[PDB]
Amino acid sequence: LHKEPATLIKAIDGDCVKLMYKGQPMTFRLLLVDTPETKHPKKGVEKYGPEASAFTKKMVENAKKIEVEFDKGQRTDKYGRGLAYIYADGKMVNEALVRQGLAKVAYVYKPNNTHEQHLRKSEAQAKKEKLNIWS
Template structure:
């Protein structure tokens, strides 16, 4: 009897144990499934972090000046006009929105600060100098010249002329007015400082340069500055009209260069680019 009772007790205990195990087993499976789900979500959480880095490496830096076209200086005609080699062709560049005093005009005399503007241009824009050309909207003027902003060593030459007081803001014709506001701001500083063309009262005006209207006292320093170029021009007109030079080397040795059309010694063979100035 005791053996039966013990056996029955053992069977009951075993049944309870099996029931407890079957109750815990679903929890274990549920936990495993949750862990699997967490693992599956983890990769997408890290993927977006890699996207910004990819965008930074592919984004190209944008310049404030727009598209710059490489060119090479051939020669300087005056402060606001120069010849360049562009795409294998010889082009004449006329700087946009600025005007420098005349030095080679066929019907006008050398104007105050014209020689200074030309000398400054030749100093910065030496033959063979690599530069960049920026076109605004309209590409050429009625003479076929390229209208452009000229960049040299990361600086705009148009602005450099204005900063030195060697040019005035001029020929403001839409749509080529991209930099007109900042040009006028630079000009205002030069006017306030009274440098260059702004050192002569009533000389630089909206419609051009007026040497005859300048005040005598303020014109005296300018006369001294431009005395040498004017003297050279006067000197070149004194020789006999039948003076001829074999080449520009001989003309330079005589101290008469540049020779303007109509002056003694001028000839077409010495004026290779046909701009009316020989041995420039």
């Protein structure tokens, strides 16, 4: 896998960021994580939604550089969104949310699962530490 540069346009929710990639504005869906959402009447503004959203937001907005890392499988989902691991100053935002108990690891679709074990290890630790969602 390899990381490529991108530029923040706008943070949208815990699990989506809009980025300028290869000169095109694009919505990215954070791979392998489910964040409580601020979006969708089919739920609404769920519990920890604003928290997961502020975290991702802060993290990408305060970064010196953003990089995207596509996995081995399909790179977009049925809504036209990029499917990636997003890094802020070298830190993976998807792991960070999971490490803080602000996301659970999603149902996984091979072959897009290269960091699954890494993330499951962080989720186990957040649950042990009974953080946020695991409170």
